């Protein structure tokens, strides 16, 4: 089965490219796999695989740490990712999120139902799994649980049966058969959860899946639109129809290849204690003291061997920073085009911890817009700031056409010298604000709302006649004969490889 | 003479470092030794020595470029500036910095008079030179002149004769026997300008002297206090009198070694076209048509096979950056410790193109004032945008302890995600603006006037009872026993030195 389609063959893919380091030797579930695993993100080393995980029983589990996580070279920086998608490892940022945008001007693919697969070569009912029996990584010091899930798929349908939603929430082990985990507005777990309290009649059937197809784990982290079922969104990307399972004990159905599947129900009445958990902006707060959602676990079902992906997350750089982040920024880019928003690429730039969405412009449509920069900023803030795409993003940052947003010394350079603080800016307070962000929940205001902004770094001449400067650098400041001339030189005259 | 004390020995210095370049074919000054130069700077190779410069007579002149640039590898980044300053080659920029500020609160000492020194073994009448003829820089291919001022120091006094300051501002020729340059309030320079002004009686008496002791151009570029002589300020800080030479045509004092001195008059009354020029923050308006001061000059002396230094300044990473901006962050540093705020440490991070400084508190200190974001933000910002040394700062950026300013990345990571936009700001309108930042000059607002800010990334509880988090970093979010065993273990695992 190709990479993109079967998380075992990824595995595979990411040893042939030698990006896996296999750990053979015991190493303890309890902070030494995460421990191993933030050095290789902070680092941008080789994906870890443990395969001798202290409390491995019976199958349950390996794991691979940082699966989304960054390269060191240049030439193929973006490869974990492009793994999950078919694509060249040496596809750029642009590539990737053009991959993950085609879908969505396309027929769904819907998937395939097949009597079987390898994820239902062991299974565990009832009365033969204990979650606080398995090797769960405690990922930081002060977590306020054990997060067996970082980087696995949540499952649920709306009561009506038309949406069946795919997504990443974080979950921890509350004991021998729940989860605790995070389920807030304005996620389409959260928005499913609803119906099913407002019907009032059952508690949510759910199963969660871990090691699923690559290509649907980017669409599980990704904000497509409401109802959208990500299945068949994955499915017109892949040019393939997914192959699922039924669950055993409900009638959701799993990827076929899924390493590991909890099948049971999310509570429509109950919660437990929640975190603290070392989060994508980087902090723990240690003893918060939130509550969160409640899953009850029946059944788990497991390929031999089972590998868990696990996100050991917080500063520079993992998953949340280079999926979460980018795959807003890729559906924003959509939604300010499809509200006749003069937007050509946006990208959130690693160095605003995700929090910031750079938006470059097509300046020349711009000016025929005859228009300003209140005017254009407080159009782009209220389409972004009010739809859910823009949640996890607190300052947008307007840019011209020079500006490749995916360069983020380039954001940094055009922020700090186009935008003046105040006047080149419009505060939004009403809109939903991200309380993750530690001056959000842990700050001065409310944790929920306000706390935006959109920051303009077009210069004045963009709106009217077009770009009055040159920049004084080595590209723009001299002729091309003579830049030319000294590329030439430069090892002869005594100054100092693309892949590397 | 040591290198410090003499720009002639500090080139052997850079030679003897192997961070130089000796380029003894012909090089074109217009535009072919600054784009060598911003191919350097842009990428932190070796300084260029350009020994056969196309038009140079009679000895006028060789030119070294990139004198206070960076270094590539990390333990010496910042060793171009320590030869300035005879500080080791690996100093630290809290070293540099407290080095620049140890003579403040130190006697001076004032400068000896030498009867003679290598400045005089040439001279050139009012008959014997044309500025026009010598091979004097096009930097940058826009720019309004040939820009023979961008490392020189201009020395001026007032006219009481207490005060004699040393300061680097721009200048480019005019005519045969005239400069037009920068001469713009709150310099002093410009205060010392307007003080001949009021007087009324006389054009001001001048000297520009290139090459001058590294230590003295450090100081030619740091905000030290109004009246104080910078001679007496680089005398304490060296702990060495400098030997100083009287000029030729007036009684101001130059330096002994200086490599080519200009002495003449800045007008009281006379302006002429000046700039543009591709500027600090890394642009070039083509075709602004300002005017700027008028020096007419009466004698050239210099030594045997002179050098000119110059900056080709724009884009990271140049003199503008590792010099204006870090020796602003140091005199910000001192003024608010002189004004009772716990301020650590300063810094201008590169990425915010020198615009910003991060400012470190001791939170214990912060804790025992009582006080809250609101007025500390004020008090910050009244304290530095209404000085001098605050001036060309736009941001203020208020960072706890855990925060090492002198890495911009960790400024951006507390930025973005402990400074609640808008909330945890203070805006100040009524406070002198630098024009010269794109977004003032350039902007939509007074391009003189305004457009500042402190941004407050001190979290809530750094004002009461201490920080309440923990980084999710490889550092903070593991013990230390585990930590050590990861990184003991690391290559023997399979994954990936300080000189490099
Ligand atoms: C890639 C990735 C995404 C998420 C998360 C993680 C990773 C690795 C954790 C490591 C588990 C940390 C966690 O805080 N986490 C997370 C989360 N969304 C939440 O509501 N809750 C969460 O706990 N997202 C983001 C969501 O996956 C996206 O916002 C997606 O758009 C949601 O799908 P949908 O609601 O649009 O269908
Ligand atoms: C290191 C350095 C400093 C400066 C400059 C340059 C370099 C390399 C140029 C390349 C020539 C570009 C130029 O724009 N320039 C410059 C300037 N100050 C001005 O008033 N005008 C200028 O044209 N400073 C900054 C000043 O040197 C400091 O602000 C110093 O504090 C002034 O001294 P003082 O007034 O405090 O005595
Ligand atoms: O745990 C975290 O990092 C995290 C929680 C969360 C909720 C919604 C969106 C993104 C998110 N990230
Ligand atoms: O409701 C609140 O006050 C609040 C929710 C929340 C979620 C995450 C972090 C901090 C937070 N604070
Ligand atoms: O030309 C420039 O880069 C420049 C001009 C200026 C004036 C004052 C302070 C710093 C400055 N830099
Ligand atoms: O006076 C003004 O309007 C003005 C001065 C100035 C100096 C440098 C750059 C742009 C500028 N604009
Ligand atoms: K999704
Ligand atoms: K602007
Ligand atoms: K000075
Ligand atoms: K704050
Ligand atoms: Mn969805
Ligand atoms: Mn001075």
């Not at 029983?57 to 492009?82: E, H, Q, T, V």
């Not at 998937?111 to 070569?121: A, D, N, Q, R, Y």
């Not at 228009?371 to 159009?379: L, Q, V």
């Not at 859910?388 to 954001?411: M, P």
């Amino acid at each position: 089965q190709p990479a993109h389609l079967c998380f075992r063959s990824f595995v595979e893919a990411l040893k042939v490219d030698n990006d896996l380091v296999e750990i053979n030797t015991p190493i303890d579930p309890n902070l030494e796999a995460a421990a191993i695993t933030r050095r290789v993100c902070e680092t941008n080393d080789k994906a870890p695989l443990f395969n001798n995980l202290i409390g491995m029983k019976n199958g349950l589990f390996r794991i691979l740490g940082a699966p989304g996580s960054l390269r060191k070279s240049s030439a193929d920086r973006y490869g974990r990712l492009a793994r999950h998608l078919a694509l060249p490892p040496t596809a750029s940022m642009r590539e990737i999120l053009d991959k993950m945008l085609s879908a969505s001007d396309m027929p769904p693919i819907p998937p395939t139902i097949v009597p079987t697969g390898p994820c239902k070569e062991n299974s565990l009912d009832d009365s033969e799994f204990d979650l606080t029996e398995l090797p769960v990584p405690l990922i930081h010091k002060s977590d306020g649980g054990k997060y067996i899930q970082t980087y696995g798929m949540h499952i649920v349908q709306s009561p009506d049966g038309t949406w069946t939603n795919w997504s990443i929430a974080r979950a921890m082990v509350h004991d021998k058969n729940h989860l605790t985990g995070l389920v807030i507005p304005p996620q389409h777990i959260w928005q499913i959860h609803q119906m099913w309290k407002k019907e009032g009649r059952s508690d949510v059937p759910w199963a969660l899946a871990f090691g699923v197809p690559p290509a649907a784990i980017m669409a599980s982290s990704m904000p497509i639109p409401d109802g959208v079922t990500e299945a068949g969104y994955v499915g017109a990307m892949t040019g393939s129809s997914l192959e699922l399972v039924k669950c055993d004990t409900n009638d959701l159905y799993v990827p076929a290849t899924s390493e590991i599947v909890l099948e049971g129900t999310l509570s429509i009445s109950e919660t437990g204690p929640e975190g603290p958990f070392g989060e994508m902006h980087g902090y723990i707060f240690p003893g918060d003291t939130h509550l969160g959602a409640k899953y009850k676990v029946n059944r788990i079902t497991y390929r031999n061997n089972a590998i868990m992906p696990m996100s050991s997350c917080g500063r520079l750089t993992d998953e949340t920073h280079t999926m979460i982040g980018s795959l807003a920024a890729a559906e924003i880019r959509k939604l300010c085009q499809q509200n006749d928003l003069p937007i050509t690429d946006a990208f959130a730039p690693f160095e605003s911890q995700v929090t910031w969405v750079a938006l470059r412009v097509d300046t020349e449509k711009l000016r025929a817009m005859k228009t300003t920069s209140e005017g254009f900023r407080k159009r782009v803030g209220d389409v972004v700031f009010n739809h859910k795409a823009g949640y996890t993003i607190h300052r947008l940052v307007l840019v011209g056409d020079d500006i490749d947003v995916y360069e983020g010394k380039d954001v940094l350079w055009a922020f700090s010298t186009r935008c003046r603080p105040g006047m080149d800016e419009t505060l939004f307070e009403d809109v939903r604000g991200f309380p993750l962000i530690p001056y959000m929940g842990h700050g001065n205001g409310p944790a929920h709302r306000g706390g935006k902004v959109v920051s303009d770094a077009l210069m004045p001449t963009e709106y009217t006649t077009g770009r009055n400067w040159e920049a004084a650098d080595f590209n723009q400041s001299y002729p091309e004969d003579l830049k030319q001339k000294v590329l030439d030189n430069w090892t002869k005259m005594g100054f100092s490889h693309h892949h590397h």
